[PDB]
Design a binder for this molecule. Structure first.
Ligand SMILES: [Mg+2]
Ligand SMILES: [Mg+2]
Lengths: 180, 180
């Protein structure tokens, strides 16, 4: 329930990877408890974007985010970045108290960068720490390389599945890589 | 030796934590192999700083970095940021090839932020991933909370010890938290 040591998982899609001139296009939040049971599903926002930014997005993402259906959802969305922030932060505020959960996902150091610039209010609620599953992957690769084979290969259309299968991935690290 | 899957550990001290107006004051690099045996000790640089920045550093760090001896070493250093970059990057280039090792340390997402802005050439050599021991700490705290008690309490005058005791810390996660 909404107390104790629950976790905020999130994933993001951007234009490219340099945040001082690149922008958030999508965000999703998933809250689990400490044992990786999904406890809640936050809002999924496609953030309004200038038609100019979206057409001259850095390519391949042009290819990928046109392919996703995501790009037009930003053309057709009136969700500012503020509103996304305001309701993202409200969402989390009812599942764990300020400053207790880390930011959990895959390669999450790079998401914070954009979170810290564009969604300052949303970041103030997270523990200063990250919990990156991709950090564990590579201890795995260097120590017990065989457990990597029980990770499921792919599939991640929406950001939710990107979150969900990074939660699944941890659970096979939990049972096959950690003492108890 | 200088091949295979060796690791670049580093730690940093800054003025404060907002990089677009805060600056690197110190850097150290330690290379280990994949089993946490220290393989090499890189240069330790105290980066030249304007007397203006250093006096109006964000306080407490004023207290701490005056206390450290670090602050005057920056006043007395002619090491630009470029030189630090140039020889940091040369150092690493002889222990692991470009794009293979992650950036390893404690709460390292926040160091990259400064690395990516101020030392771009040094970052191009790291795997895009971080390996953060502080990520493991909190899986520990949430799953087998008892193993935290074999972590050694503190002591970290220089950046080296900050690196070294984050390498020590992993080794007690290795033996008491991970299957094998
Ligand atoms: Mg992602
Ligand atoms: Mg540090």
């Amino acid at each position: 329930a909404g107390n104790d040591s629950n976790l905020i998982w999130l994933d993001l899609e951007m234009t490219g990877l340099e945040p001082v001139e690149d922008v958030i296009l999508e965000i999703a939040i998933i809250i689990t408890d400490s044992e990786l049971n999904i406890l809640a599903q936050g809002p999924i926002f496609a953030i309004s974007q200038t038609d100019d930014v979206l057409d001259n997005m850095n390519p391949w993402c042009i290819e990928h985010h046109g392919k996703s259906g995501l790009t037009q959802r930003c053309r057709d969305s009136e969700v500012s970045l503020a509103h996304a922030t305001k309701e993202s932060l409200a969402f989390v505020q009812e599942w764990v108290p300020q400053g207790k959960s880390p930011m959990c996902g895959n390669s999450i150091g790079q998401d914070r960068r954009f979170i810290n610039k564009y969604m300052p209010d949303f970041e103030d609620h997270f523990h200063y720490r990250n919990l990156d599953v991709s950090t564990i992957k590579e201890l795995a690769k260097r120590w017990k390389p065989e457990v990597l084979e029980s990770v499921v290969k792919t599939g991640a259309h929406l950001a939710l599945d990107d979150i969900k299968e990074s939660i699944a991935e941890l659970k096979v690290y939990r049972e096959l890589f950690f003492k108890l």
